[PDB]
């Protein structure tokens, strides 16, 4: 069921672009709307930013193939390179309705699109990064993820990760034969 | 600059000898811990330690009977080189 990796990587790329739209990491003047999941989405048209997102999900896809990823996380960092909010895609993995699962992903997009309602404003000058939490610490994980030259990965320190006393804002959970995933946000207690 | 407790270098050289010499199949977790130790030396601007750590490990790991320690060394260095290539524009000599 490595279709899941192909489906998830498509979805995560779309969800990362939308997350940076909705949280204002980047100017409105680089987004353009496009249709995924027969819901609209708002994707970047900046090449360097698009390359960073595609480079990242190119390296993750094979860890997804073996169900070796517990979480893919989009981290909003503050100007001090400190996490301020985290969008966590928590992942658990033939009556096969692959066609119906892709459309269950639309509800993620609509929840993401309206999530500034239920979240505090971020400090100005935020950037982001991507964390991949593996199910187990395995040599094979890092062998698979270092395939793009000029795009190496490292093991994150507690600084790349740690938020004191965060709040948890659940957004959407799905429960299928082939894809068990939920999206929740962790926001920093304060600014 | 942590390696599983040891800040002082000579202590690191000592945690790494006990580990490589007495244990014939290392857990992947500990190999990853040495890679993170090495990439942290890069962030913290200690290329001399980095060089000395690689040299110490290359001796001990390549001298092992157990072929696992040989492939663990290749793995460690591979993940250090790709960090150096980007952070410094270059590759560590041996």
């Amino acid at each position: 069921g490595q279709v899941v990796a192909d489906v998830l990587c498509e979805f995560l790329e779309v969800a990362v672009h939308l997350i940076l739209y909705v949280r204002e990491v980047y100017p409105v003047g680089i987004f353009q709307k496009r249709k995924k999941y027969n819901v609209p989405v708002q994707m970047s048209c900046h090449p360097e930013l698009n390359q960073y997102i595609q480079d990242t999900l190119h390296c993750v896809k094979p860890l997804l193939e073996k169900n070796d990823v517990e979480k893919v996380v989009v981290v909003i960092l503050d100007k001090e390179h400190r996490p301020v909010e985290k969008f966590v895609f928590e992942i658990t993995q033939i009556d096969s309705l692959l066609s119906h699962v892709e459309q269950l992903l639309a509800a993620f997009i609509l929840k993401i699109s309206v999530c500034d309602a239920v979240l505090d404003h971020n400090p100005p000058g935020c950037t982001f990064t991507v964390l991949v939490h593996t199910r187990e610490a395995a040599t094979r994980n890092m062998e698979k993820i270092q395939v793009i030259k000029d795009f190496p990965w490292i093991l994150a320190d507690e600084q790349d990760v740690h938020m004191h006393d965060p709040r948890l804002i659940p957004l959407k959970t799905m429960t299928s034969d082939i894809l068990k995933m939920q999206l929740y946000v962790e926001e920093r207690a304060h600014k | 600059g942590n390696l599983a407790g040891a800040v002082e270098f000579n202590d690191v050289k000592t945690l790494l000898r006990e580990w490589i010499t007495t244990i014939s199949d290392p857990m992947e977790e500990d190999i990853l811990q040495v890679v993170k130790y090495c990439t942290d030396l890069i962030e913290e601007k200690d290329l001399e330690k980095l060089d000395l750590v690689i040299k110490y490990m290359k001796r001990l790991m390549q001298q092992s009977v157990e072929s696992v320690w040989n492939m663990a060394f290749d793995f460690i260095l591979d993940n250090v080189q790709v960090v150096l290539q980007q952070t410094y524009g270059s590759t560590l000599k041996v």
């Binding site: 990491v25 980047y26 100017p27 003047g29 680089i30 900046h46 360097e48 930013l49 960073y52 997102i53 480079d55 990242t56 390296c59 517990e70 000058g125 935020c126 950037t127 982001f128 990064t129 991507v130 964390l131 991949v132 939490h133 593996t134 199910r135 187990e136 610490a137 994980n141 890092m142 993820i145 000029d150 795009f151 190496p152 990965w153 490292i154 093991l155 994150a156 507690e158 790349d160 990760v161 | 942590n2 599983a4 977790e29 990853l32 811990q33 890679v35 993170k36 960090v83 980007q86 952070t87």
Partner: peptide
């Protein structure tokens, strides 16, 4: 200090780089 968290070394382009 468990070692199961991977991240790109590289930063994405800064809000600056993009409005060139």
């Amino acid at each position: 200090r468990t070692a199961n968290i991977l991240k790109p070394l590289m930063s994405p382009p800064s809000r600056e780089e993009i409005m060139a």
